[PDB]
Amino acid sequence: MIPVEQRTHKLTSRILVGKPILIKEGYAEVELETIDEMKVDEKGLVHGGFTFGLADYAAMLAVNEPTVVLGKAEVRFTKPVKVGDKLVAKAKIIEDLGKKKIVEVKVYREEEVVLEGKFYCYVLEKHVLD
């Protein structure tokens, strides 16, 4: 594979969302060590919003275009995540419809899938905030 530098979402929190560990044409991998602030109860259950955020970010890097944004997403949480789990999201463009890209993302905890989803991404003429 030929590595590509990150061209979008550059200031994304490495602590709250993730650290990209691989970015190439049409594919990206980002890892996240879950922390205590991400919990929703005393049992250590991690809020799905963080798992989704990690997957969302991987999807943006699978497209890796400056103006890329997430328009729609369908996700299934398959296994609960506990504080202390290390997660890895693997995102691949599965359909290139020009400016619209359909990216499939699966988030893993070692070999187990904890989240699976389709992310509908759009590369805009200009940055989403105008």
Task: Tell me the technique behind this structure.
Answer: X-ray
Q: List the one residue out of 92, 90, 88, 91 whose CA is nearest residue 109.
A: 88
- Pick the closest to residue 12 from 58, 49, 51 (CA basis): 58
Long-range contacts of 91-95 (CB under 8 A, 24+ apart): 91/27, 91/28, 91/29, 91/30, 91/55, 91/58, 91/59, 91/61, 91/62, 91/119, 92/26, 92/27, 92/62, 93/26, 93/27, 93/62, 93/63, 94/118
Whether residue 121 contacts residue 101, with contact meaning beta carbons closer than 8 Å, is answered with yes
Domain-wise residue ranges, the chain? 2-130
Dist. CA 19–CA 36, nearest whole Å: 18
Among the four given CATH numbers 3.40.640.10, 3.40.50.2000, 3.30.70.1380, 3.10.129.10, the one describing domain 2-130:
3.10.129.10
Among the residues of the chain, which ranges form H helices? 48-63
Resolution in A: 1.9
| Cβ neighbours of residue 123 closer than 8 Å, sequence gap 6 or more | 63, 65, 67, 68, 99, 100, 101
Output Rg (C-alpha) for the chain, integer angstroms.
14
Alpha carbon distance 10, 82 (integer Å):
27
Most distant CA pair in the chain, distance = 46
3-class secondary-structure state, position 62: helix
